[PDB]
Amino acid sequence: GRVRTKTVKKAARVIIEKYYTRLGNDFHTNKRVCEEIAIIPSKKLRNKIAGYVTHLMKRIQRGPVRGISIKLQEEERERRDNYVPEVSALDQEIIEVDPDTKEMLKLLDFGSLSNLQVTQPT
Amino acid sequence: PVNYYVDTAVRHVLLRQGVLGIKVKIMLPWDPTGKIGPKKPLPDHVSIVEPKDEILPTTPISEQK
Amino acid sequence: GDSKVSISFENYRKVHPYEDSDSSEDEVDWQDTRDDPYRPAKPVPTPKKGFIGKGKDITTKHDEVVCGRKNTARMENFAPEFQVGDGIGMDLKLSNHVFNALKQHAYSEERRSARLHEKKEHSVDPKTRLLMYKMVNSGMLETITGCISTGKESVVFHAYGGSMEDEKEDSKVIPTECAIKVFKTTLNEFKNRDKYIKDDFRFKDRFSKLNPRKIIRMWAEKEMHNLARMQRAGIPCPTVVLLKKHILVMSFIGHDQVPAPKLKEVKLNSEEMKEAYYQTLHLMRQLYHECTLVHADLSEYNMLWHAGKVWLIDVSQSVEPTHPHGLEFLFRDCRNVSQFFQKGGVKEALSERELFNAV
RNA sequence: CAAGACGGACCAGAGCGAAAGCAUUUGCCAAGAAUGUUUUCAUUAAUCAAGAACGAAAGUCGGAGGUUCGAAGACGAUCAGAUACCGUCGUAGUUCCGACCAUAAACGAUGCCGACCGGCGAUGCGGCGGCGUUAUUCCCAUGACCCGCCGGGCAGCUUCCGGGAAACCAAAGUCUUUGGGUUCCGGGGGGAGUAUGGUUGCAAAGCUGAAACUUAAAGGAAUUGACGGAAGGGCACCACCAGGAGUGGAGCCUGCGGCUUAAUUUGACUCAACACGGGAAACCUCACCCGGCCCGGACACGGACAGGAUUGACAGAUUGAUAGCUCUUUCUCGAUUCCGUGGGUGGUGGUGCAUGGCCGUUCUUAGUUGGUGGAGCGAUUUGUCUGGUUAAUCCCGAUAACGAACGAGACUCUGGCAUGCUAACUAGUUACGCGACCGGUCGGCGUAACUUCUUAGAGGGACAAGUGGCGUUCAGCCACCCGAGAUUGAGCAAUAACAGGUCUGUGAUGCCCUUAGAUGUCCGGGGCUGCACGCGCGCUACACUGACUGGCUCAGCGUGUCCUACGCCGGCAGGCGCGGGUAACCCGUUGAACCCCAUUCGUGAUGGGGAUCGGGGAUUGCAAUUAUUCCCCAUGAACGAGGAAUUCCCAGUAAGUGCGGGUCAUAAGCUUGCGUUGAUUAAGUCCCUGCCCUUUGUACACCGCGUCGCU
RNA sequence: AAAGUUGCUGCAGUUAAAAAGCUCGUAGUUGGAUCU
């Protein structure tokens, strides 16, 4: 049918990997800037590279890419990665604990903690 | 490409036993013709120029020149 | 290094006014000169004392370096299937412990290739002619006269049979004129015959794995059995005298070495055509009822006109009525007979369905 | 009711026994391991020639009883050859008592005793300690449970301890860093556990046990896959479905066989020969046949030769031939030579199985191979996949692999699009004017523009691009908008191969054969085409959707120094004159055919269709006899849609229709291309055939050729 | 001699040739610590 080969896919991959900024989801804007960078032969190779670039940046909007690796990841995933909640989930007001663990704490000279609540294994 | 890169040259040599045929197919390289090699590259190779490392924006600077 | 999708470092290149500097443009030409290592040494005659020179720089006879270069050059004269490499460009000091093993391998490889090539080279018919000559010398046939008809599957030869001097009470009478049908065993076109052979219960277990020669022998045996069944029912057919492998000898239909004309080639009158149609219908009814077989190849060529009588031949493809395609073959034969009779002007010839119902 | 049998299900990698073996309740008799022991002896032990007890099944003597099953034996089926095979009966045996036999794949294919070296938790027995649960909450111990621990067992799981040729083993480890104790036993494969001897047994047979001779291997692990007919998957109008055109049914042409011939050169013989060898041959071609001519035998040696080696030759004879080819005729010619010895040339003369090159085929496929890294001693393996994906090992993603290269793709030519660009007196239009005819037509004439039509160069354009579904929501697949095109047709074509064709294409060619009444050259004629018959392409038709005639009206490749216009004579074929064109300039605006309208013929072997045959005419050629072709009357035959079988094809396609080129002095029924008219069906499969591709196994085992004869 | 293919040094015995069907047992062979 119509399956893109090794050369066009690898070229589109390295075109995504570096020069990611100057291209875009619009098709023809990619076309010319491919000519502005890669000294490419025929226009059938060019118009086939510029097709997979648009088809790959449409795929970027669905999340990560398993084949490329640049440490930019839009500007939202960086914002999503350094999310900090207002209250720590670790400073819990009360914790349910096994008596064996409390025995370990007492043996550890840490027997005077106040946030602990000993529960029984019913 | 097989028309202007490889240089096929068949020759016949005559020995005591008979005739031996010789084929020598030498593929020309790139680096356009400073007396060596054809101009146009192989119609598949794409070479990508790395970008000039540009200055990232820090402060809006208006310099009159 | 060799990838098609490549990267260019042009922007990081700083200064290049004169790119074609005369430092990388060294003209390297050493082939036609005397500096190429790929050149004969112009060998010196062998010393008799066994060494060259004297003192401490005495270069001896074998002189492991020299002998290694010599063994490399002797490798250069190996078999074409051997692969050496670049053993002269790189100084290869190869020893007899290694070179003799490689030489033995080259000899074994060339010898086994020669053995494979020699095994490859070691891979009416003459056997049928020898069988016919043996039958003629045995007194069964006096002389092979000629070929009467040449078919696609078998060849029919008219011949004169011999007079057996053995006074046996059970000896079959040899006819004066005989027809020998020899099945063609060198033709691969006989492949659809399994449609009429595998469906027979008398030979399915044997034709399930039979060779083509065995298939031809089984077909000849089936033809002889069909001829015997037709002769037992009184149907007009050639009487088989003896069958040998793929050659079956039967009674010739005709006189003075002239075969009987076919129904298509015989210009019979209207009454003669009606009599021939009636005789064909009677023979078909006798074959369906008494012989319990369907000819399945009944046509104008299969029926011969002789002495005002219709004789049936080529019963090799005949099958019993119990076969899964016996009824369809009988209907096709009846349709062909009806078409042949209607073409001859027989107004009394019944239709294909009527002939199938009557038979 | 009786007779003997056997204790299933409970039955587990559980238990016991020295092993063989050992499952119905209860009782009796002695045994026995493990455990527990601040019990008793105190080295009493481990392994063991001789010797001894036990030793499954089968077998052997005596007795008993005999259900069932059953060697032997008796039936019946089954066939080219069954005597193995299957179903029915049935003796010894299988059952118990008392004596022999003492052999098994009697196996863990792993002697016994002792120590050490990783871990884990299940199970049986005994013992120890307990959060706690149950005997209708048990009144306290106690059995059935749970959580551990110890000893001794049958096993298991995991590991890069270690070992091994490896499979594998926690013992097969603690082994060239080689010694805890002890018994048996092996020394290449057969002969052979055979003969002989001894001994046991009633016997069958057991134990012990060679030699002669013969053989260079036999044997053990592991790796790749030839090969599977073993299986599924997959692809193909050189396969199928649905169909169209047919072929095979006639006539003719051509090719290949056979039959003749002086010769009817020659190769090629399923696809991968048979309108192929540019192979449509009057001579040539031409190799073949029937006969002639010449040396066009270089060069070296020797002889002849100047007092001539010779060449050529008029006239007559011969001769097809002004063939001195030979004789007569005697004229020429100045070493240009001749005769043998040598060896050179010329071969379309032999070997494509000695070769190169070229081409064809497997295959127009779907593979091929390194580098670095991992595993293994190594052969080798991963990369080169579970799956999905595509025309594609084309791709995605898993992933001890990561990246590559060749092939496919990209590329190149052609086609569809550009009212944007370039610019045309060797292309075209429009306008104006000049006319000509009745504001319309002019391919009928000239200058203003102009590039839409025509040319041919650059650039652009189309990418699964956008949308909706499907998707392992990746890769990509169906449908739709817009667009000229959501996409044609070819060229090139990998690794590994084929005894595929070609010496007959070469002044390519090795060994050669011949070389002067030549297998060399040339000439004359014949033949390649000869015909009882067979096999393949191809062309005409079988009539009405047709044929005849008249009128009408549109191309494209693309040749041409021969292509031809125009005028004249002829009915045509042709002939004469004057021109142009070495070429978008001329033929030509290429007034092509099928097709479009009208007339006549109306189902009739008919005027359909023109095979065969006579006569005449013209051209090309030295030469048309074997009709070279072309033209005109006449003759009008098979053939009324074709058996078995079979070919090709998916969209400007198949079919129908003609034009150009190649061959060509003379010429296309062939072929290479080109337009014109223009469809049906399907868009799906393994049903035939062919080719794949993955998995598993994987480097001819055995039972069923003889009788006699004399020296 | 290579032959570690005669093995005391110094071979082997699950699958390549090979551990007796099993147990007792005499001769043989080897035998816990412990006395300056």
UniProtKB/Swiss-Prot annotation, chain A:
Subcellular location as annotated: Cytoplasm; Nucleus, Nucleolus
BP GO terms, sorted: cytoplasmic translation; erythrocyte homeostasis; ribosomal small subunit biogenesis; rRNA processing; translation; translational initiation
Post-translational modification: Ubiquitinated at Lys-102 by RNF14 and RNF25 in response to ribosome collisions (ribosome stalling).
UniProt keyword list: Cytoplasm, Diamond-Blackfan anemia, Isopeptide bond, Nucleus, Phosphoprotein, Ribonucleoprotein, Ribosomal protein, Ubl conjugation
InterPro entries: Ribosomal_eS17, Ribosomal_eS17_CS, Ribosomal_eS17_sf
Entry GO terms, CC: cytoplasm; cytosol; cytosolic ribosome; cytosolic small ribosomal subunit; focal adhesion; membrane; nucleolus; nucleoplasm
Cross-link (Glycyl lysine isopeptide (Lys-Gly) (interchain with G-Cter in SUMO2)): 102
Phosphoserine modifications at: 112
A GO molecular function held by the record: RNA binding
N6-succinyllysine, modified sites: 18
Tree of life domain: Eukaryota
UniProt crosslink position (Glycyl lysine isopeptide (Lys-Gly) (interchain with G-Cter in SUMO1)): 102
Function of the molecule: Component of the small ribosomal subunit. The ribosome is a large ribonucleoprotein complex responsible for the synthesis of proteins in the cell. Part of the small subunit (SSU) processome, first precursor of the small eukaryotic ribosomal subunit. During the assembly of the SSU processome in the nucleolus, many ribosome biogenesis factors, an RNA chaperone and ribosomal proteins associate with the nascent pre-rRNA and work in concert to generate RNA folding, modifications, rearrangements and cleavage as well as targeted degradation of pre-ribosomal RNA by the RNA exosome.
Assembly mode: Component of the small ribosomal subunit. Part of the small subunit (SSU) processome, composed of more than 70 proteins and the RNA chaperone small nucleolar RNA (snoRNA) U3.
Annotated family: Belongs to the eukaryotic ribosomal protein eS17 family.
Stated name of the protein: Small ribosomal subunit protein eS17
Record lineage: Eukaryota, Metazoa, Chordata, Craniata, Vertebrata
Curated annotation (Swiss-Prot), chain B:
Name the UniProt record assigns to this protein: Small ribosomal subunit protein uS3
Subunit structure: Component of the 40S small ribosomal subunit. Identified in a IGF2BP1-dependent mRNP granule complex containing untranslated mRNAs. Interacts with HNRPD. Interacts with PRMT1; the interaction methylates RPS3. Interacts with SUMO1; the interaction sumoylates RPS3. Interacts with UBC9. Interacts with CDK1; the interaction phosphorylates RPS3. Interacts with PRKCD; the interaction phosphorylates RPS3. Interacts with PKB/AKT; the interaction phosphorylates RPS3.
Record flagged with keyword Secreted: no
Modifications after synthesis and translation: Methylation by PRMT1 is required for import into the nucleolus and for ribosome assembly.
Entry keyword Signal: no
Classification of source organism: Eukaryota, Metazoa, Chordata, Craniata, Vertebrata
Protein family according to the UniProt entry: Belongs to the universal ribosomal protein uS3 family.
Domain of life of the native organism: Eukaryota
Full-protein interval shown: 163 to 227 of 243
Keywords for this protein: Acetylation, Apoptosis, Cell cycle, Cell division, Cytoplasm, Cytoskeleton, DNA damage, DNA repair, DNA-binding, Isopeptide bond, Lyase, Membrane, Methylation, Mitochondrion, Mitochondrion inner membrane, Mitosis, Nucleus, Phosphoprotein, Ribonucleoprotein, Ribosomal protein, RNA-binding, Transcription, Transcription regulation, Translation regulation, Ubl conjugation
Residues joined by cross-link Glycyl lysine isopeptide (Lys-Gly) (interchain with G-Cter in ubiquitin): 40, 52
Gene name for this UniProt entry: RPS3
Subcellular locations according to the entry: Cytoplasm; Nucleus; Nucleus, Nucleolus; Mitochondrion inner membrane
Modification Phosphoserine occurs at: 47, 62
UniProtKB/Swiss-Prot annotation, chain C:
Keyword Transferase appears in the UniProt entry: yes
Composition bias type Acidic residues, residue spans: 20-30
Outcome reported for the amino acid change (mutating residue 181 to A): Decreases autophosphorylation (in vitro); abolishes inhibition of TNF-alpha-induced NF-kappaB activation; no effect on interaction with IRF3; fails to activate IFN-beta promoter and IRF3 phosphorylation
Molecular function GO labels: ATP binding; caspase binding; metal ion binding; protein serine kinase activity; protein serine/threonine kinase activity
Catalytic activity as recorded in UniProt: L-seryl-[protein] + ATP = O-phospho-L-seryl-[protein] + ADP + H(+); L-threonyl-[protein] + ATP = O-phospho-L-threonyl-[protein] + ADP + H(+)
Residues bearing the modification Phosphotyrosine: 18
Cellular localisation: Cytoplasm
Alphabetical keyword list: Antiviral defense, ATP-binding, Cytoplasm, Immunity, Innate immunity, Kinase, Magnesium, Metal-binding, Nucleotide-binding, Phosphoprotein, Ribosome biogenesis, Serine/threonine-protein kinase, Transferase
Domain Protein kinase, first and last residues per copy: 142-359
Signal peptide stretch: none
PTM text: Autophosphorylated (in vitro).
Top EC class for this record: transferase
UniProt cofactor(s): Mg(2+)
Sites where the protein binds ATP: 148-156, 181
Phosphoserine: residues carrying this PTM: 8, 21, 23-24
Keyword Nucleotide-binding belongs to the record: yes
Region of interest called Disordered, as start-end residue ranges on this chain: 17-55
UniProt GO BP: cellular response to dsDNA; cellular response to dsRNA; cellular response to virus; chromosome segregation; defense response to virus; innate immune response; maturation of SSU-rRNA; negative regulation of canonical NF-kappaB signal transduction
Source organism, top-level taxon: Eukaryota
Expressing tissues: Widely expressed.
Active site per the UniProt annotation: 297 (proton acceptor)
EC number of the protein: 2.7.11.1
Subunit (UniProt): Interacts with CASP10. Interacts with IRF3; RIOK3 probably mediates the interaction of TBK1 with IRF3. Associated with 40S pre-ribosomal particles.
Family to which this protein belongs: Belongs to the protein kinase superfamily. RIO-type Ser/Thr kinase family.
Protein name per UniProt: Serine/threonine-protein kinase RIO3
Species whose genome carries this gene: Homo sapiens (Human)
Taxon lineage: Eukaryota, Metazoa, Chordata, Craniata, Vertebrata
Gene name, Swiss-Prot/TrEMBL: RIOK3
Whole-protein residues included: 105 to 468 of 519
